[PDB]
Design a binder for this molecule. Sequence first.
Ligand SMILES: CC(C)c1cc(C(=O)N2CCc3ccccc3C2)c(O)cc1O
Ligand SMILES: CC(C)c1cc(C(=O)N2CCc3ccccc3C2)c(O)cc1O
Lengths: 207, 207
Amino acid sequence: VETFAFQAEIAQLMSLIINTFYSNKEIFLRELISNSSDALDKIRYESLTDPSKLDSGKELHINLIPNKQDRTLTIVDTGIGMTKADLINNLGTIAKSGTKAFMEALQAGADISMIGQFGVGFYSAYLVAEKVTVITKHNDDEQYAWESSAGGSFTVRTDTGEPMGRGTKVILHLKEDQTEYLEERRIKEIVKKHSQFIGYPITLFVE
Amino acid sequence: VETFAFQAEIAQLMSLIINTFYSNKEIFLRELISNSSDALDKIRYESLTDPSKLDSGKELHINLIPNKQDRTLTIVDTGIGMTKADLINNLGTIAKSGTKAFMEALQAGADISMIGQFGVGFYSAYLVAEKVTVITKHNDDEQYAWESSAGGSFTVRTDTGEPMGRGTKVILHLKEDQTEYLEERRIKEIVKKHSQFIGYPITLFVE
Ligand SMILES: CC(C)c1cc(C(=O)N2CCc3ccccc3C2)c(O)cc1O
Ligand SMILES: CC(C)c1cc(C(=O)N2CCc3ccccc3C2)c(O)cc1O
């Protein structure tokens, strides 16, 4: 288990998300699904010119898995996945994101729902989750587990639990008062409201 | 001068944009600026780990250049730019875009303003332009000019006019009835309405 610090501005953004009063939390799901879609776009695109990249799974889809007993909502995709390095650079640093622009926007009148415009939508997970686990598998690396309850750090370790094939799985350990998002009709409502046009099957599992 | 065919679905999307009655054309600028921003994000990001990528220009900005005499609106950025190959793959084929999802969305109630959600916002240029020229320079290639008046094809050639350094320049040869978008106050209005939060300076040139 390796423990890393978030880049300062990331930590600041996370704090903002966790601490700002903002009721319209449901947008977290849209942003996660949107990331999934992007990742699926990427493998689809690369696999045009190299079909062997599908050897780890041809089906391109997104699964939504609620679990009331564990109080978790899991979003799984069969997208391109992330290597260890992608994982650490993309989740722990500003990278190609508009972290700064977002935080500045928030001061100039913008609202949190616009987070996706700035390439940092993943962190909206922290509107509803006390902890977030990201399990990922890229064709070019082994399976890794990223994890963070915020507070300025995250961990990365190899994951030898259930091999995934290829893709990314985001496990949301929900806050106590956010169990709303484990309810079939609530989830259905949100997907219809915000993600009806996504170009990949979205399957909502039942319990 | 090499002449290429658009991938069928691209050609179909372009036709849709050109032929669909849709008054809210001003969104074209938002989408172009958004592409610019993304491209600037990318060079910013790569230049963290390799500062020599800025040798071709350290300033990261977007310029808006109207020209009433030529009836053109030009959008210039100092982003990462595109190689010849990126140019041909990214503008001529579906690539990583949601072209299909967009066109399907349009049938299921979506509207053209949502084009950006599907990674094909560039083509909104054809709401206002009869022709679009894209001049680009990536650190890893020479300067190239892409061009298309739609109708199913585009051309690519080396550009030895004015070297750019690094970046992408989108020249919009406006349709006769769209000279609206050469007016300083109109442009100002649109940038404020749709692109106020972009994280790079946007400079509007005067004539
Ligand atoms: C944890 C967040 C950030 C996240 C990342 C991915 C992912 O694997 N990439 C892989 C690389 C890539 C390439 C293009 C577009 C998006 C992505 C995201 C995903 O599928 C879902 C997610 O919710
Ligand atoms: C003609 C359209 C498509 C377009 C492309 C670019 C561009 O150079 N890339 C370069 C590669 C890249 C990488 C990440 C995000 C966007 C972009 C767009 C741009 O700066 C502006 C544009 O309006």
